[PDB]
């Protein structure tokens, strides 16, 4: 009868931002003051809702989106943001309702030789709609000649590796981000505050 946020936050593996993972939360009581208890959070920002009223609100569904990005890219996981992540990887709506949670994960996602396993999308023909997910690998046509699925000049693989080394600057270090989107529809509520 208590929402298992630990499956999301205390998970051992995190998705790349371009293939960001989503988990649904329902049929439980969400005590956000207990979630805010982890003093390890470098970012805990809620939008469209008052953080103190969180334990007094009900919603139709709550979604937990989790992924990994750079340090100085957490600023893009917010409504109205632009950049490689907000345009091509993960996009929140203007009228977003939920919280953005993030913490430095340099000890987990960095290797001394360099961890390049976390990916992101670098090019895309158009920006992402809110909560749109693109895991395609179409050869991006940067020039005017078609690519026909062949990499070459002005025909680039759309994905790119990050490169997390423990001796990087804090803005190039891996951060893990959880977004708790709160959804209100004409359906019975499944998540409430205590």
């Amino acid at each position, epitope marked *: 009868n208590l929402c298992p946020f630990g499956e999301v936050f205390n998970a051992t593996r995190f998705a790349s931002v371009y293939a960001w993972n989503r988990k649904r939360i329902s049929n439980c009581v969400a005590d956000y003051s207990v979630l805010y208890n982890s003093a390890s959070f470098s970012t805990f920002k809620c939008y469209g809702v008052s953080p103190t009223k969180l334990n007094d609100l009900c919603f139709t569904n709550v979604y937990a989106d989790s992924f990994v990005i750079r340090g100085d890219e957490v600023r893009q996981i917010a409504p109205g943001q632009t950049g490689k992540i907000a345009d091509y990887n993960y996009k929140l709506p203007d009228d977003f309702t939920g919280c953005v949670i993030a913490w430095n994960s340099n000890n987990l996602d960095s290797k001394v*030789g*360099g961890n390049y*396993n976390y990916l992101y999308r670098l090019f895309r023909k158009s920006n992402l709609k809110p909560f749109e997910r693109d895991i395609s690998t179409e050869i991006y046509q940067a020039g005017s000649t078609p690519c026909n699925g062949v990499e070459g*000049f002005n025909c*680039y*693989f759309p*994905l790119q*590796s990050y490169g997390f080394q423990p001796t990087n600057g804090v803005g190039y270090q891996p951060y893990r981000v959880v977004v708790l989107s709160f959804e209100l529809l004409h359906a019975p509520a499944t998540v409430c505050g205590p």
Partner: nanobody
Framework: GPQVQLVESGGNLVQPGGSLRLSCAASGGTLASFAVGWFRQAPGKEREGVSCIDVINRANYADSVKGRFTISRDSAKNTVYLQMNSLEPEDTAVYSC??????????????????????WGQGTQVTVSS
């Protein structure tokens, strides 16, 4: 595969005038983030770069293999190929793969002037003999 690793394939004993395609399958990341260069070490001679390719897929070749070799990229298989045509006995060597990362801003690391690579495969042997 937490660390980046390269593995070469395609080596074989071939005849003069024959052709081979060597593969460089990478692991632990997108090879499309990396400059890839091919090298060969013949017995008794020094290690010699033969072909490389930028992250924007610009190619360059040593003068000793120009017009005969073709480097190409297939990042869908995390692989960079090397097509070798009109093989002569002087091509007999251990052909090894090499990679080094290119940050998105510094999108010029890769040209054969950047011949200091960080990751290396074990090499595959190509023997050209009648």
């Amino acid at each position: 595969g937490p660390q980046v690793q390269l593995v070469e394939s395609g080596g074989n004993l071939v005849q003069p005038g024959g052709s081979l395609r060597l593969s460089c399958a990478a692991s632990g990341g997108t090879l499309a983030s990396f400059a890839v260069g091919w090298f060969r070490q013949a017995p008794g001679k020094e290690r010699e770069g033969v072909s490389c390719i930028d992250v924007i897929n610009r190619a360059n070749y040593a003068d000793s293999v120009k017009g005969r070799f073709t480097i190409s990229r297939d990042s869908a298989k995390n692989t960079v190929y090397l097509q070798m045509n009109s093989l002569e006995p002087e091509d007999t060597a251990v052909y090894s793969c090499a990679a080094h990362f290119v940050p998105p801003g510094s999108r010029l690391r890769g040209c054969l002037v950047n011949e200091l690579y960080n990751y290396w495969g074990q090499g595959t042997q190509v023997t050209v003999s009648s």
